[PDB]
Design a protein around this ligand. Structure first.
Ligand SMILES: OC[C@H]1O[C@H](O[C@H]2[C@H](O)[C@@H](O)[C@@H](O)O[C@@H]2CO)[C@H](O)[C@@H](O)[C@@H]1O
Length: 380
């Protein structure tokens, strides 16, 4: 059961949960309502189990891609922003939180992976994926490593799979065709094949993860990483002189990172729907509230127009938007959960040699996405 006269907010560990707590304490001062911010693990999996029963947090933060499945499960209170509120945010960020004609969450910020590089180790970063092997060989002679990024989560490898023609679900009227999967087409095979080639030649490791890759770049042992704006705060701390820049091309085609819209939904079983609406519209989506959060750990290109005009000055945010333009907004449909689960098995297996690239993502299309779609939609 959720307590009336209180807000509990859930956001991911990698985001600025402490800045958001400052917006919490400001809210507390004005209204008397205590705001408790939490960053539990496997947040996106924990919210559905907990909220369906009883009852979870009042407000949930995640990128938009998971919110269709949440609305479809009945978990999100349909929001009620008026026209004046809407026009303070960029039209395409509203689109990412629209589902069956209705808005279901407030959009916060636009997240896109970029190439992050060490200027001292690598003044002039490589423009292409094809240049990386040779660079790694040149850096292995001096004890260091060319590129180290998270290979456990498909969000990070996707830019390379999509680069040459791969895609999740086709767009369409539309409308996304869940029968038309672009995950065993030639562009994906080519992107994943290239990735597994880097791993066969000892240029990357299969079992590199978010922690390991961050530690590596931040302690000056890698020339390059691939991360989002949330990670800039800790590179700042490490003192590594770094730059954020366009993702490398593959066969001359831009890397196409899936673009996420950090979003806030109101739990459907919360008795504090108004307090939540007040919190999000009047405290968070202000220059001042988005400042507090952005200063803990940056959001990227925020959805609020007035504050974005101050942030577009940052070269590192111009690079984030450069990369987002080259990419595609993520679908928000419910079958994204299924899609993500399956793709994560395929890539891990392909990357570890358990299967070949052609086997891994032939199984994916032919059975795993549909099997997982059916498993998610059946109860377990
Ligand atoms: O890797 C699958 C995962 O990708 C995305 O998650 C991102 C998220 O958008 C970022 O904001 C940050 O939290 O890193 C995550 C990668 O672990 C999808 O948004 C998410 O649904 C999916 O599980």
């Amino acid at each position: 059961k959720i307590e009336e006269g209180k807000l509990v907010i859930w956001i991911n560990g990698d985001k600025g949960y402490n800045g958001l707590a400052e917006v919490g304490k400001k809210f507390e001062k004005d209204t008397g309502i205590k705001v408790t911010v939490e960053h539990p693990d496997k947040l996106e999996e924990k919210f559905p189990q907990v909220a369906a029963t009883g009852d979870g947090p009042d407000i949930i933060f995640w990128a938009h891609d998971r919110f269709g499945g949440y609305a479809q499960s009945g978990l999100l209170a349909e929001i009620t922003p008026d026209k004046a509120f809407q026009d303070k945010l960029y039209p395409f960020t509203w689109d990412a939180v629209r589902y069956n004609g209705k808005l279901i969450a407030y959009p916060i910020a636009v997240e896109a992976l970029s190439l992050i590089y060490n200027k001292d180790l690598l003044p002039n970063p490589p423009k292409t994926w094809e240049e990386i092997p040779a660079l790694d060989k040149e850096l292995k002679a001096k004890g260091k490593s060319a590129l180290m990024f998270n290979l456990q989560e498909p969000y990070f490898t996707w830019p390379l799979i999509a680069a040459d023609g791969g895609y999740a679900f086709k767009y369409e009227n539309g409308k996304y065709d869940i029968k038309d999967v672009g995950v065993d087409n030639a562009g994906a095979k080519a992107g994943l094949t290239f990735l597994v080639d880097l791993i066969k030649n000892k240029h990357m490791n299969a079992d590199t993860d978010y922690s390991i890759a961050e530690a590596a770049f931040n302690k000056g042992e890698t020339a390059m990483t691939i991360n989002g704006p949330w990670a800039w705060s800790n590179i700042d701390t490490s003192k590594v002189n770094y730059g954020v820049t366009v993702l490398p091309t593959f066969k001359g085609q831009p890397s196409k990172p899936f673009v996420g819209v950090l979003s806030a939904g109101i739990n459907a079983a919360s008795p504090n729907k108004e307090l939540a609406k007040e919190f999000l519209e009047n405290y968070l989506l202000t220059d001042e509230g988005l400042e507090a959060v952005n200063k803990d750990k940056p959001l990227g290109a925020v959805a609020l127009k007035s504050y974005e005009e101050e942030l577009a000055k940052d070269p590192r945010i111009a690079a984030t938007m450069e990369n987002a333009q080259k990419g595609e907004i993520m679908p928000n449909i419910p079958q994204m959960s299924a899609f993500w689960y399956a793709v994560r098995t395929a890539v891990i297996n392909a990357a570890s040699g358990r299967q070949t690239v052609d086997e891994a993502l032939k199984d994916l299309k032919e059975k795993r996405i549909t099997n997982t779609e059916a498993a998610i939609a059946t109860g377990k």
